[PDB]
Amino acid sequence: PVDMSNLFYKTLLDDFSRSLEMQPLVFDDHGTCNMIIDNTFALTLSCDYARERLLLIGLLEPHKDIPQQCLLAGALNPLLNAGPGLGLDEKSGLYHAYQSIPREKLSVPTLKREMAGLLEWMRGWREA
Amino acid sequence: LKANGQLEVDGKRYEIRAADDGTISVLRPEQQSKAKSFFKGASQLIGGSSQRAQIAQALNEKVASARTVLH
């Protein structure tokens, strides 16, 4: 049978959409919700049901000549302050920014705060 | 019943839209290819993607069923 508790993420997403006063955002049949923010940033919310967490994932766009050592220092950010991370996806060759929120900690204000955090992290890298 | 949500948090306002092919076309053209590649790969990023998609599809079917009960 279907584990109905896994609809928690959708319920949250509906409440978030209501807060944003917008047509409801939806998770697709891969458990993801792709969004464009401010006609500038690409962001995805992804439900990791097995690990009981929601992922916020963003497309990073560092300067072509940012030293890889700088990006690797950035990669430690989650350790330093529980903020967003970064890494290289080898399938696409694109740098990804990410934040994970355990199901236990999800709420509409937490999701809002963490999305803004991710966005500002993306903004900093793109213009560094 | 607007497509463009306003996320307000910490003295900032962000406009959110769902990312369909239409909304991607509005990005600057020099931004679109990477955005498309990012979105295409995003749902496969996390380990166990097959099984996650099986779960997601089943949940969405249940949601569709609950709507039919009302109607």
PDB file of C-alpha atoms in Angstrom:
ATOM      1  CA  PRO A   1       0.000   0.000   0.000  1.00  0.00           C
ATOM      2  CA  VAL A   2       0.749   3.683  -0.350  1.00  0.00           C
ATOM      3  CA  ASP A   3       2.228   5.319   2.711  1.00  0.00           C
ATOM      4  CA  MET A   4      -0.104   8.314   3.063  1.00  0.00           C
ATOM      5  CA  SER A   5       2.246  10.049   5.503  1.00  0.00           C
ATOM      6  CA  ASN A   6       4.426  10.767   2.490  1.00  0.00           C
ATOM      7  CA  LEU A   7       1.808  13.382   1.447  1.00  0.00           C
ATOM      8  CA  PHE A   8       3.153  15.630   4.252  1.00  0.00           C
ATOM      9  CA  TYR A   9       5.430  17.374   1.709  1.00  0.00           C
ATOM     10  CA  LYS A  10       2.524  18.190  -0.614  1.00  0.00           C
ATOM     11  CA  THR A  11       0.495  19.521   2.277  1.00  0.00           C
ATOM     12  CA  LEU A  12       3.355  21.807   3.215  1.00  0.00           C
ATOM     13  CA  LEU A  13       3.757  22.900  -0.393  1.00  0.00           C
ATOM     14  CA  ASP A  14       0.047  23.731  -0.515  1.00  0.00           C
ATOM     15  CA  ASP A  15       0.306  25.820   2.642  1.00  0.00           C
ATOM     16  CA  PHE A  16       3.418  27.562   1.238  1.00  0.00           C
ATOM     17  CA  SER A  17       1.570  28.354  -2.020  1.00  0.00           C
ATOM     18  CA  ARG A  18      -1.357  29.748   0.027  1.00  0.00           C
ATOM     19  CA  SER A  19       1.050  31.946   1.963  1.00  0.00           C
ATOM     20  CA  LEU A  20       2.675  33.119  -1.329  1.00  0.00           C
ATOM     21  CA  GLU A  21      -0.933  33.831  -2.507  1.00  0.00           C
ATOM     22  CA  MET A  22      -0.442  31.898  -5.721  1.00  0.00           C
ATOM     23  CA  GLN A  23      -1.753  29.154  -7.830  1.00  0.00           C
ATOM     24  CA  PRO A  24      -0.654  25.968  -6.015  1.00  0.00           C
ATOM     25  CA  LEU A  25       2.798  24.657  -6.693  1.00  0.00           C
ATOM     26  CA  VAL A  26       2.881  20.911  -7.291  1.00  0.00           C
ATOM     27  CA  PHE A  27       5.267  18.049  -7.006  1.00  0.00           C
ATOM     28  CA  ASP A  28       5.585  16.084 -10.235  1.00  0.00           C
ATOM     29  CA  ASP A  29       5.687  12.270 -10.549  1.00  0.00           C
ATOM     30  CA  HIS A  30       9.373  12.365  -9.652  1.00  0.00           C
ATOM     31  CA  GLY A  31       8.668  14.099  -6.396  1.00  0.00           C
ATOM     32  CA  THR A  32      10.093  17.454  -7.574  1.00  0.00           C
ATOM     33  CA  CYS A  33       8.839  20.995  -7.901  1.00  0.00           C
ATOM     34  CA  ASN A  34      10.885  23.158 -10.331  1.00  0.00           C
ATOM     35  CA  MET A  35      10.679  26.878  -9.910  1.00  0.00           C
ATOM     36  CA  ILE A  36      12.155  30.059 -11.396  1.00  0.00           C
ATOM     37  CA  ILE A  37      12.749  32.899  -8.931  1.00  0.00           C
ATOM     38  CA  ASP A  38      12.895  36.524  -9.975  1.00  0.00           C
ATOM     39  CA  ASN A  39      13.402  35.483 -13.627  1.00  0.00           C
ATOM     40  CA  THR A  40      16.946  34.722 -12.584  1.00  0.00           C
ATOM     41  CA  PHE A  41      17.429  31.676 -10.399  1.00  0.00           C
ATOM     42  CA  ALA A  42      16.635  28.046 -11.007  1.00  0.00           C
ATOM     43  CA  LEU A  43      15.501  26.151  -7.841  1.00  0.00           C
ATOM     44  CA  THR A  44      13.979  22.736  -7.262  1.00  0.00           C
ATOM     45  CA  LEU A  45      12.274  21.259  -4.225  1.00  0.00           C
ATOM     46  CA  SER A  46      12.756  17.491  -4.112  1.00  0.00           C
ATOM     47  CA  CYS A  47      11.069  15.037  -1.758  1.00  0.00           C
ATOM     48  CA  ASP A  48      13.360  12.363  -0.387  1.00  0.00           C
ATOM     49  CA  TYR A  49      10.721  10.130   1.129  1.00  0.00           C
ATOM     50  CA  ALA A  50      13.042   7.292   2.137  1.00  0.00           C
ATOM     51  CA  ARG A  51      15.286   9.619   4.124  1.00  0.00           C
ATOM     52  CA  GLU A  52      12.484  11.794   5.459  1.00  0.00           C
ATOM     53  CA  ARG A  53      13.803  15.081   4.192  1.00  0.00           C
ATOM     54  CA  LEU A  54      13.020  17.865   1.726  1.00  0.00           C
ATOM     55  CA  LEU A  55      15.846  19.081  -0.501  1.00  0.00           C
ATOM     56  CA  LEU A  56      16.201  22.598  -1.803  1.00  0.00           C
ATOM     57  CA  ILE A  57      18.466  22.531  -4.844  1.00  0.00           C
ATOM     58  CA  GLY A  58      19.743  25.460  -6.843  1.00  0.00           C
ATOM     59  CA  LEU A  59      21.759  26.025 -10.028  1.00  0.00           C
ATOM     60  CA  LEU A  60      25.013  27.801  -9.126  1.00  0.00           C
ATOM     61  CA  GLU A  61      26.788  29.956 -11.726  1.00  0.00           C
ATOM     62  CA  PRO A  62      30.279  30.787 -10.442  1.00  0.00           C
ATOM     63  CA  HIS A  63      32.731  32.807 -12.606  1.00  0.00           C
ATOM     64  CA  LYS A  64      34.562  30.431 -14.957  1.00  0.00           C
ATOM     65  CA  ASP A  65      37.853  31.414 -13.228  1.00  0.00           C
ATOM     66  CA  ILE A  66      36.849  31.209  -9.538  1.00  0.00           C
ATOM     67  CA  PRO A  67      39.592  28.964  -8.179  1.00  0.00           C
ATOM     68  CA  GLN A  68      38.371  25.427  -7.349  1.00  0.00           C
ATOM     69  CA  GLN A  69      39.975  25.957  -3.891  1.00  0.00           C
ATOM     70  CA  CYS A  70      37.438  28.732  -3.232  1.00  0.00           C
ATOM     71  CA  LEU A  71      34.519  26.483  -4.187  1.00  0.00           C
ATOM     72  CA  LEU A  72      35.938  23.734  -1.910  1.00  0.00           C
ATOM     73  CA  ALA A  73      36.033  26.208   1.001  1.00  0.00           C
ATOM     74  CA  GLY A  74      32.417  27.040   0.232  1.00  0.00           C
ATOM     75  CA  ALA A  75      31.646  23.313   0.342  1.00  0.00           C
ATOM     76  CA  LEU A  76      32.349  23.390   4.102  1.00  0.00           C
ATOM     77  CA  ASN A  77      29.613  25.889   4.797  1.00  0.00           C
ATOM     78  CA  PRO A  78      27.091  23.315   6.135  1.00  0.00           C
ATOM     79  CA  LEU A  79      29.593  22.335   8.799  1.00  0.00           C
ATOM     80  CA  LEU A  80      30.339  25.912   9.767  1.00  0.00           C
ATOM     81  CA  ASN A  81      26.778  27.157  10.223  1.00  0.00           C
ATOM     82  CA  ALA A  82      24.178  24.597   8.935  1.00  0.00           C
ATOM     83  CA  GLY A  83      23.681  26.756   5.863  1.00  0.00           C
ATOM     84  CA  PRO A  84      23.637  25.744   2.267  1.00  0.00           C
ATOM     85  CA  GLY A  85      26.275  23.640   0.608  1.00  0.00           C
ATOM     86  CA  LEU A  86      27.676  23.267  -2.860  1.00  0.00           C
ATOM     87  CA  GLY A  87      29.179  20.608  -5.051  1.00  0.00           C
ATOM     88  CA  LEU A  88      29.744  19.474  -8.614  1.00  0.00           C
ATOM     89  CA  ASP A  89      27.351  17.254 -10.385  1.00  0.00           C
ATOM     90  CA  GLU A  90      29.398  15.148 -12.803  1.00  0.00           C
ATOM     91  CA  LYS A  91      26.428  14.119 -15.018  1.00  0.00           C
ATOM     92  CA  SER A  92      25.739  17.765 -16.005  1.00  0.00           C
ATOM     93  CA  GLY A  93      29.051  19.484 -15.191  1.00  0.00           C
ATOM     94  CA  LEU A  94      27.055  22.025 -13.289  1.00  0.00           C
ATOM     95  CA  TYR A  95      27.641  23.279  -9.752  1.00  0.00           C
ATOM     96  CA  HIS A  96      24.672  22.791  -7.427  1.00  0.00           C
ATOM     97  CA  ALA A  97      23.787  24.625  -4.224  1.00  0.00           C
ATOM     98  CA  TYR A  98      21.683  22.626  -1.740  1.00  0.00           C
ATOM     99  CA  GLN A  99      19.990  22.677   1.674  1.00  0.00           C
ATOM    100  CA  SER A 100      18.244  19.760   3.350  1.00  0.00           C
ATOM    101  CA  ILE A 101      15.414  20.137   5.859  1.00  0.00           C
ATOM    102  CA  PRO A 102      14.428  17.022   7.858  1.00  0.00           C
ATOM    103  CA  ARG A 103      10.696  16.288   7.826  1.00  0.00           C
ATOM    104  CA  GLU A 104      10.617  16.908  11.634  1.00  0.00           C
ATOM    105  CA  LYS A 105      11.740  20.504  11.119  1.00  0.00           C
ATOM    106  CA  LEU A 106       9.565  21.481   8.167  1.00  0.00           C
ATOM    107  CA  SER A 107       7.177  24.364   8.414  1.00  0.00           C
ATOM    108  CA  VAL A 108       6.116  27.158   6.146  1.00  0.00           C
ATOM    109  CA  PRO A 109       8.352  29.809   7.864  1.00  0.00           C
ATOM    110  CA  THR A 110      11.351  27.379   7.887  1.00  0.00           C
ATOM    111  CA  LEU A 111      10.906  26.613   4.243  1.00  0.00           C
ATOM    112  CA  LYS A 112      10.680  30.378   3.457  1.00  0.00           C
ATOM    113  CA  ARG A 113      13.796  31.144   5.527  1.00  0.00           C
ATOM    114  CA  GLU A 114      15.801  28.332   4.022  1.00  0.00           C
ATOM    115  CA  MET A 115      14.800  29.175   0.438  1.00  0.00           C
ATOM    116  CA  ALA A 116      15.838  32.839   0.962  1.00  0.00           C
ATOM    117  CA  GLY A 117      19.114  31.575   2.442  1.00  0.00           C
ATOM    118  CA  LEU A 118      19.792  29.408  -0.511  1.00  0.00           C
ATOM    119  CA  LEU A 119      18.976  32.196  -2.930  1.00  0.00           C
ATOM    120  CA  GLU A 120      21.287  34.668  -1.256  1.00  0.00           C
ATOM    121  CA  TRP A 121      24.062  31.994  -1.277  1.00  0.00           C
ATOM    122  CA  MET A 122      23.465  31.506  -5.018  1.00  0.00           C
ATOM    123  CA  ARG A 123      23.542  35.277  -5.508  1.00  0.00           C
ATOM    124  CA  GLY A 124      26.895  35.572  -3.695  1.00  0.00           C
ATOM    125  CA  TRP A 125      28.536  32.850  -5.769  1.00  0.00           C
ATOM    126  CA  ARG A 126      27.287  34.113  -9.068  1.00  0.00           C
ATOM    127  CA  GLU A 127      28.816  37.470  -8.563  1.00  0.00           C
ATOM    128  CA  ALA A 128      31.937  36.519  -6.564  1.00  0.00           C
TER     129      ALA A 128
ATOM    130  CA  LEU B   1      -5.563  33.506  -8.906  1.00  0.00           C
ATOM    131  CA  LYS B   2      -1.982  34.571  -9.749  1.00  0.00           C
ATOM    132  CA  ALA B   3       0.905  32.527 -11.214  1.00  0.00           C
ATOM    133  CA  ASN B   4       3.464  34.708  -9.465  1.00  0.00           C
ATOM    134  CA  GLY B   5       3.816  34.230  -5.764  1.00  0.00           C
ATOM    135  CA  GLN B   6       5.504  36.630  -3.483  1.00  0.00           C
ATOM    136  CA  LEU B   7       7.819  35.082  -0.943  1.00  0.00           C
ATOM    137  CA  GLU B   8       8.507  37.641   1.761  1.00  0.00           C
ATOM    138  CA  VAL B   9      11.100  36.847   4.363  1.00  0.00           C
ATOM    139  CA  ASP B  10      13.725  38.917   6.234  1.00  0.00           C
ATOM    140  CA  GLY B  11      12.958  42.236   4.484  1.00  0.00           C
ATOM    141  CA  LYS B  12      13.122  40.711   0.971  1.00  0.00           C
ATOM    142  CA  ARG B  13      10.464  39.883  -1.581  1.00  0.00           C
ATOM    143  CA  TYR B  14      10.999  37.181  -4.194  1.00  0.00           C
ATOM    144  CA  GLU B  15       8.769  36.348  -7.086  1.00  0.00           C
ATOM    145  CA  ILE B  16       8.189  32.653  -7.545  1.00  0.00           C
ATOM    146  CA  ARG B  17       6.870  30.921 -10.661  1.00  0.00           C
ATOM    147  CA  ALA B  18       6.553  27.322 -11.589  1.00  0.00           C
ATOM    148  CA  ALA B  19       9.199  26.279 -14.125  1.00  0.00           C
ATOM    149  CA  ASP B  20       7.464  25.136 -17.228  1.00  0.00           C
ATOM    150  CA  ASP B  21       8.783  25.412 -20.803  1.00  0.00           C
ATOM    151  CA  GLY B  22       6.933  28.697 -21.152  1.00  0.00           C
ATOM    152  CA  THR B  23       8.445  30.257 -18.053  1.00  0.00           C
ATOM    153  CA  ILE B  24      11.987  29.072 -19.027  1.00  0.00           C
ATOM    154  CA  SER B  25      11.614  30.995 -22.330  1.00  0.00           C
ATOM    155  CA  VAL B  26      11.375  34.207 -20.352  1.00  0.00           C
ATOM    156  CA  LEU B  27      14.843  33.824 -18.797  1.00  0.00           C
ATOM    157  CA  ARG B  28      17.610  35.684 -20.690  1.00  0.00           C
ATOM    158  CA  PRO B  29      18.494  33.524 -23.640  1.00  0.00           C
ATOM    159  CA  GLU B  30      22.083  33.123 -22.442  1.00  0.00           C
ATOM    160  CA  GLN B  31      20.734  31.599 -19.162  1.00  0.00           C
ATOM    161  CA  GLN B  32      18.250  29.124 -20.622  1.00  0.00           C
ATOM    162  CA  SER B  33      20.425  26.193 -21.683  1.00  0.00           C
ATOM    163  CA  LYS B  34      21.975  25.640 -18.219  1.00  0.00           C
ATOM    164  CA  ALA B  35      18.617  26.158 -16.536  1.00  0.00           C
ATOM    165  CA  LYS B  36      17.099  23.531 -18.801  1.00  0.00           C
ATOM    166  CA  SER B  37      19.968  21.106 -18.112  1.00  0.00           C
ATOM    167  CA  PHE B  38      19.632  21.716 -14.347  1.00  0.00           C
ATOM    168  CA  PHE B  39      15.877  21.044 -14.370  1.00  0.00           C
ATOM    169  CA  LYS B  40      16.233  17.959 -16.544  1.00  0.00           C
ATOM    170  CA  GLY B  41      18.736  16.336 -14.205  1.00  0.00           C
ATOM    171  CA  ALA B  42      17.321  17.585 -10.888  1.00  0.00           C
ATOM    172  CA  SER B  43      14.976  14.725 -10.145  1.00  0.00           C
ATOM    173  CA  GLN B  44      17.707  12.113 -10.770  1.00  0.00           C
ATOM    174  CA  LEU B  45      20.247  13.743  -8.459  1.00  0.00           C
ATOM    175  CA  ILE B  46      19.363  11.985  -5.244  1.00  0.00           C
ATOM    176  CA  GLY B  47      20.252   8.324  -4.805  1.00  0.00           C
ATOM    177  CA  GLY B  48      17.304   5.932  -5.150  1.00  0.00           C
ATOM    178  CA  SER B  49      15.626   7.970  -7.916  1.00  0.00           C
ATOM    179  CA  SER B  50      13.642   5.018  -9.331  1.00  0.00           C
ATOM    180  CA  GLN B  51      11.978   4.196  -6.111  1.00  0.00           C
ATOM    181  CA  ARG B  52      11.358   7.840  -5.235  1.00  0.00           C
ATOM    182  CA  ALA B  53       9.538   8.301  -8.554  1.00  0.00           C
ATOM    183  CA  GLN B  54       7.428   5.183  -7.900  1.00  0.00           C
ATOM    184  CA  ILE B  55       6.358   6.657  -4.580  1.00  0.00           C
ATOM    185  CA  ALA B  56       5.673  10.124  -6.056  1.00  0.00           C
ATOM    186  CA  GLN B  57       3.520   8.770  -8.864  1.00  0.00           C
ATOM    187  CA  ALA B  58       1.467   6.715  -6.406  1.00  0.00           C
ATOM    188  CA  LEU B  59       0.914   9.663  -4.085  1.00  0.00           C
ATOM    189  CA  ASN B  60      -0.217  11.845  -6.959  1.00  0.00           C
ATOM    190  CA  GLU B  61      -2.738   9.187  -8.008  1.00  0.00           C
ATOM    191  CA  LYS B  62      -4.130   9.190  -4.470  1.00  0.00           C
ATOM    192  CA  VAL B  63      -4.463  12.955  -4.571  1.00  0.00           C
ATOM    193  CA  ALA B  64      -6.382  12.689  -7.847  1.00  0.00           C
ATOM    194  CA  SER B  65      -8.694  10.121  -6.241  1.00  0.00           C
ATOM    195  CA  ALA B  66      -9.463  12.337  -3.260  1.00  0.00           C
ATOM    196  CA  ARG B  67     -10.500  15.108  -5.657  1.00  0.00           C
ATOM    197  CA  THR B  68     -12.977  12.721  -7.342  1.00  0.00           C
ATOM    198  CA  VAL B  69     -14.628  12.020  -3.942  1.00  0.00           C
ATOM    199  CA  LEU B  70     -15.499  15.730  -3.657  1.00  0.00           C
ATOM    200  CA  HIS B  71     -16.817  15.917  -7.194  1.00  0.00           C
TER     201      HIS B  71
END
